[PDB]
Design an enzyme around this catalytic site. Structure first.
Site, PDB file in Angstrom:
ATOM      1  N   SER B 203       0.843  -1.208   0.000  1.00  0.00           N
ATOM      2  CA  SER B 203       0.000   0.000   0.000  1.00  0.00           C
ATOM      3  C   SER B 203       0.881   1.263   0.000  1.00  0.00           C
ATOM      4  O   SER B 203       1.740   1.432  -0.879  1.00  0.00           O
ATOM      5  CB  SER B 203      -1.002  -0.048   1.167  1.00  0.00           C
ATOM      6  OG  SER B 203      -1.730   1.158   1.338  1.00  0.00           O
ATOM      7  N   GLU B 327      -8.766  -5.534  -4.262  1.00  0.00           N
ATOM      8  CA  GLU B 327      -8.157  -4.344  -3.686  1.00  0.00           C
ATOM      9  C   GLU B 327      -9.167  -3.411  -3.000  1.00  0.00           C
ATOM     10  O   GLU B 327      -8.872  -2.829  -1.957  1.00  0.00           O
ATOM     11  CB  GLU B 327      -7.357  -3.590  -4.760  1.00  0.00           C
ATOM     12  CG  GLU B 327      -6.128  -4.331  -5.266  1.00  0.00           C
ATOM     13  CD  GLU B 327      -5.002  -4.428  -4.217  1.00  0.00           C
ATOM     14  OE1 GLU B 327      -5.118  -3.784  -3.152  1.00  0.00           O
ATOM     15  OE2 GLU B 327      -4.005  -5.149  -4.465  1.00  0.00           O
ATOM     16  N   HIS B 440      -7.333  -5.963   0.537  1.00  0.00           N
ATOM     17  CA  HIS B 440      -6.087  -5.238   0.540  1.00  0.00           C
ATOM     18  C   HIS B 440      -5.321  -5.502   1.859  1.00  0.00           C
ATOM     19  O   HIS B 440      -5.848  -5.265   2.949  1.00  0.00           O
ATOM     20  CB  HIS B 440      -6.477  -3.772   0.390  1.00  0.00           C
ATOM     21  CG  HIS B 440      -5.334  -2.823   0.219  1.00  0.00           C
ATOM     22  ND1 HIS B 440      -4.573  -2.769  -0.929  1.00  0.00           N
ATOM     23  CD2 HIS B 440      -4.881  -1.829   1.020  1.00  0.00           C
ATOM     24  CE1 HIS B 440      -3.691  -1.791  -0.824  1.00  0.00           C
ATOM     25  NE2 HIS B 440      -3.858  -1.206   0.350  1.00  0.00           N
TER      26      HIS B 440
HETATM   27  O1  GC8 Z   1      -8.978   3.850   4.684  1.00  0.00           O
HETATM   28  C1  GC8 Z   1      -9.354   3.995   5.814  1.00  0.00           C
HETATM   29  C2  GC8 Z   1     -10.235   5.195   6.285  1.00  0.00           C
HETATM   30  O2  GC8 Z   1      -9.886   5.647   7.523  1.00  0.00           O
HETATM   31  C3  GC8 Z   1     -10.690   6.520   8.215  1.00  0.00           C
HETATM   32  C4  GC8 Z   1     -11.317   7.624   7.603  1.00  0.00           C
HETATM   33  C5  GC8 Z   1     -12.106   8.525   8.300  1.00  0.00           C
HETATM   34  C6  GC8 Z   1     -12.285   8.353   9.679  1.00  0.00           C
HETATM   35 CL1  GC8 Z   1     -13.257   9.468  10.542  1.00  0.00          CL
HETATM   36  C7  GC8 Z   1     -11.677   7.276  10.353  1.00  0.00           C
HETATM   37  C8  GC8 Z   1     -10.894   6.397   9.598  1.00  0.00           C
HETATM   38 CL2  GC8 Z   1     -10.146   5.079  10.456  1.00  0.00          CL
HETATM   39  N1  GC8 Z   1      -8.987   3.015   6.803  1.00  0.00           N
HETATM   40  C9  GC8 Z   1      -8.187   1.818   6.653  1.00  0.00           C
HETATM   41  C10 GC8 Z   1      -7.832   1.208   5.422  1.00  0.00           C
HETATM   42  C11 GC8 Z   1      -7.057   0.051   5.398  1.00  0.00           C
HETATM   43  C12 GC8 Z   1      -6.602  -0.572   6.575  1.00  0.00           C
HETATM   44  C13 GC8 Z   1      -5.783  -1.765   6.352  1.00  0.00           C
HETATM   45  N2  GC8 Z   1      -4.401  -1.585   5.582  1.00  0.00           N
HETATM   46  C14 GC8 Z   1      -3.493  -0.845   6.591  1.00  0.00           C
HETATM   47  C15 GC8 Z   1      -2.083  -0.687   6.134  1.00  0.00           C
HETATM   48  C16 GC8 Z   1      -1.513  -2.039   5.653  1.00  0.00           C
HETATM   49  C17 GC8 Z   1      -2.422  -2.717   4.628  1.00  0.00           C
HETATM   50  C18 GC8 Z   1      -3.820  -2.901   5.134  1.00  0.00           C
HETATM   51  C19 GC8 Z   1      -6.934   0.020   7.792  1.00  0.00           C
HETATM   52  C20 GC8 Z   1      -7.701   1.184   7.834  1.00  0.00           C
END
Ligand code: GC8
Ligand code: GC8
Ligand code: NAG
Ligand code: NAG
Ligand code: NAG
Lengths: 533, 535
Positions: B203, B327, B440
């Site tokens: 990512s 994804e 993902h």
């Molecule tokens: O995309 C988001 C959105 O996050 C937020 C947006 C708005 C608010 Cl209020 C609050 C939030 Cl939280 N969260 C997300 C996406 C993927 C993963 C998992 N990904 C993490 C990095 C390694 C690969 C997998 C965890 C959280």
């Protein structure tokens, strides 16, 4: 003297001729006048009813072919020649033809009325592929076909003028339909069961009769083969027709009344000489004088009318051949020819798109190229060639047909759709063109039933099946044989399931979605695109 | 010293370290955790480029993970494993610039190829200390030297007032570069080969790896790169100077704040105050959008990644790139109405149309229309199962799959050696619902070989599969070719080329070669959409 060949219609007596079909004789009455010769001051004017005649009028031969441009792309080649006039040209051309069983039908028989295509610029009811004797002999149908004025004579319009109101060629067709109502019973035909059918510009004419109220009391069912009233070629706006008419008048040396008057003095071939010179862009599948949105015959655009019409009590059978676009490539797109496999470069493909989609902005043309390119083989000549054919076929026939079928189905009509996939063993065009525009006709009309035509025995059996679908549809509005089980059945096209059938040597197969993804691009996205850009 | 394990004592440029002997399934490994590589970017150093850590005295204890960089913590599903596994597992702090090293035990007697991991998490989150990044298995089983580093994320890493001295932007990337320099200088002391360093990340970590390829000063710090489900091109990985300045001054205003005065005032704010307003500065309601990310500064990034990949020379570059099967599915539950982990998320046409605006937040009305037309199934335009899956595919294709396809195509055409994959196996232990498929981030546990740990409850096939993947990655790190030269029997992984567009499926079955990385759809995203936007 054969009394089966003697008939009286409202205008007088006719003598017909006994013709041989492979299975028996039929009665043909060819060259029946249905209107006053649209000549002199009658040019560009709506037709008038034919005056009564004395004695017995000889209807044993095809009459003259309406004045029209004659193809010269491949001089003396059967593939092109078969569409050219097979009788003398004349503006005096308003005659129809009637075939019936011999003896003539004991009880009133469903009537099929053929309307030829030819881009509204050409065609004739006398062509060998329109021979009605097979359907008459085998299915005991009463078959009728008319000549209608083409090119400038049928469709030149100065919108709003009294003398060149436009659409007279469609009025010719309508008068012929009126004639059938008034007279067909005398041949053993049933005026209360009339089916229109036609191909290309003929199918589009059939569609325009669907969309024009005064035509509606003259037929009960319709068949549209590879053509539609909607779409990019079948109609023009008043503004654009006016433009083309005064440009042609400029080329020939010519207040609307003054202008039309000088045109009326011009010999026919002089008008035809400049037919192709009035198109706004270099193009293919585009025709100079075609039906006009007059606000009269067509109260609105066919798009508007199919979108809002009420098609409750109405049955329609519509379809396409496998390769709608291939034929047209050799008439304008560089790199294409009947004499080689026409493998094209990517450059040629982009150039080709601006010609097959002449009305397209750069951005829209860009969208078309990106949609039809196979990105796994973006440069492959075979793919690029076949894609070029597909762009033309889809834009001009397949997607207009999917759009009509869908609007008709949603708005109450009974619709049956097909795709025709058999390529004639006798075809003289190259293999790369596959099943070209117009080559299902000879099978519907039953020509393979003639041994001397050298079709295969499978093609004979196939033609018979087709004749049955078509005549069964004429009889009932349903192409399915009524006392035969196991087929399986040809299902109605619906908006939910979108079922259509393939017509070929193998038994009916049912498919769903008529190029659904690709026609959504054409009918849903492209309009939004050019709408702004 | 004296009674310590003599295999756990090592000197680096900054001083002496004591590491720990860790148990892996097949034997011991050496871990050196919490090695500082920079001065704590605290106080007056907030927003500033990192400074190399000044030498320390005595033996630094390197036996436990250090602080996680200050970041927004996910609260979408409190206590649910599927979200918690990504959350900070150590105390949050601005004092967080530490890196970790795993090596075989005893340490390698000949110079061993090094792998450096860069975590993802949208540039706002992440930590090198998470369980799924455990280097013990690659170290033990493949004999790798593995390094992972913490880098600043969010405002602390990426808030930029472009052109200013005090907040030039991209400092999170400069953190990563500093660790890379640290590896060049010190990794030989662990038995690692500094002349064979492979970067890999997922990512935003992948996007990071891509930035190092595109940024000249980083280029001499590595030799090969792996980008897992992320790219430096694409719609979420960078922002223009103008947009970064806009987001920075909004955040300042949100916490109550000439660039010097502004930055100075931000430096007086509690870290948590900044984090609390992270998501409040995005221009549109969106998913797969992050407030503070690398900026096109004309410095670290001399131009946009798109222009750089399109026109750069990568003759002597070797890359492995790939995507997972689904994804987009993960992101839908963080913003698209109608999506949950608790139901099948069967949506309506209306929800699909609203969803597209959120998942393609920069698109005009017409562009959105184009997207909806392309992804709609016109035989079943109202079917909820199809619309759910199409929504997932819109987000996945736009953000990952097509930027990846674009990256691979430009790199290959420009002389790089490229290997591409799609990862199609769903972990038997996944706690997310089935509708999400292979989401993902869920290949990572297989690359690091977690299934080798019996206590995790993976299947035997999963264990064997994980071993295969470790082999591919380490083989690639070693040679720039994921294939094993000592095993011709197995199917080969051919390079990706413009002419053949070959990639492989990674799942429980043997390697299968496929052509075209979503070629038809990606043409839409990659060739058409930009042309539309220029109109
Ligand atoms: O995309 C988001 C959105 O996050 C937020 C947006 C708005 C608010 Cl209020 C609050 C939030 Cl939280 N969260 C997300 C996406 C993927 C993963 C998992 N990904 C993490 C990095 C390694 C690969 C997998 C965890 C959280
Ligand atoms: O469309 C054209 C192009 O016409 C022309 C244009 C310009 C010039 Cl200079 C010259 C020309 Cl010619 N020709 C064409 C297309 C189809 C058929 C076959 N079609 C005829 C009616 C029934 C269905 C099959 C014949 C000619
Ligand atoms: C096919 O023949 C035509 C006419 O002879 C020519 O113009 C065209 O270039 C040829 N195409 C190829 C691919 O050779
Ligand atoms: C799934 O559940 C969530 C909350 O329980 C709800 O908000 C959402 O609308 C549901 N989706 C569907 C498609 O039922
Ligand atoms: C693995 O399975 C055992 C047996 O049911 C169970 O007790 C244990 O908690 C499981 N461990 C995990 C991490 O799920």
């Amino acid at each position: 003297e054969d009394p089966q060949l003697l008939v009286r219609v409202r205008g007088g007596q006719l003598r017909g001729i006994r013709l041989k079909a492979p299975g028996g004789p039929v009665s043909a009455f060819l060259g029946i006048p249905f209107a006053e010769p649209p000549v002199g001051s009658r040019r560009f004017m709506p037709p008038e009813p034919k005056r009564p005649w004395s004695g017995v009028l000889d209807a044993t031969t095809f009459q003259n072919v309406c004045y029209q441009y004659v193809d010269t792309l491949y001089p003396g080649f059967e593939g092109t020649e078969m569409w050219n006039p097979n009788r003398e040209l004349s503006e005096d051309c308003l005659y129809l033809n009637v075939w019936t069983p011999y003896p003539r039908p004991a009880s009133p028989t469903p009537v099929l009325i053929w309307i030829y295509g030819g881009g509204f610029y050409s065609g004739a009811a006398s062509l060998d592929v329109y021979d009605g004797r097979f359907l008459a002999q085998v299915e005991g149908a009463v078959l009728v076909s008319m000549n209608y004025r083409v090119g400038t004579f049928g469709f030149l319009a100065l919108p709003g003028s009294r003398e060149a109101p436009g659409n007279v060629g469609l009025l010719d067709q309508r008068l012929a339909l009126q004639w059938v109502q008034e007279n067909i019973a005398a041949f053993g035909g049933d005026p209360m069961s009339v089916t229109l059918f036609g191909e290309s510009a003929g199918a589009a004419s059939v569609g325009m009769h669907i969309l024009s109220l005064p035509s509606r009391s003259l037929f009960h069912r319709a068949v549209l083969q590879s053509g539609t009233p909607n779409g990019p070629w079948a109609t023009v706006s008043a503004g654009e027709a006016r433009r083309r008419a005064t440009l042609l008048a400029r080329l020939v040396g010519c207040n609307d009344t003054e202008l039309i008057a000088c045109l009326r003095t011009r010999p026919a071939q002089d008008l035809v000489d400049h037919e192709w010179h009035v198109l706004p862009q270099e193009s293919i599948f585009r025709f100079s004088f075609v039906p006009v949105v007059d606000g009269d015959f067509l109260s609105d655009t066919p798009e508007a009318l199919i979108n809002t019409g009420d098609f409750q009590d109405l049955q329609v059978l519509v379809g396409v051949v496998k390769d709608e676009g291939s034929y047209f490539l050799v008439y304008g797109v560089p790199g294409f020819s009947k004499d080689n496999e026409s493998l094209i470069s990517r450059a040629q493909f982009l150039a080709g798109v601006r010609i097959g989609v002449p009305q397209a902005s750069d951005l829209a043309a860009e969208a078309v190229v990106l949609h039809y390119t196979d990105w796994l083989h973006p440069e492959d000549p075979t793919h690029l060639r076949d894609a070029m054919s597909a762009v033309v076929g889809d834009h001009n026939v397949v997607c207009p047909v999917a759009q009509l079928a869908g609007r008709l189905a949603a708005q109450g009509a009974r619709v049956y759709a097909y795709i025709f996939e058999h390529r004639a063993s006798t075809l003289t065009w190259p293999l790369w063109m596959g099943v070209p525009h117009g080559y299902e006709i000879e099978f519907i009309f039953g020509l393979p039933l003639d041994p001397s035509l050298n079709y295969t025995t499978e093609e004979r059996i196939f033609a018979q099946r087709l004749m049955k679908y078509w005549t069964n549809f004429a009889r009932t509005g349903d192409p399915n044989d009524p006392r035969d089980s196991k087929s399986p059945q040809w299902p109605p096209y619906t908006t939910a399931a979108q079922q259509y059938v393939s017509l070929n040597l193998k038994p009916l197969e049912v498919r769903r979605g008529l190029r659904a993804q690709t026609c959504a691009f054409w009918n849903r996205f492209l309009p939004k695109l050019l709408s702004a850009t």
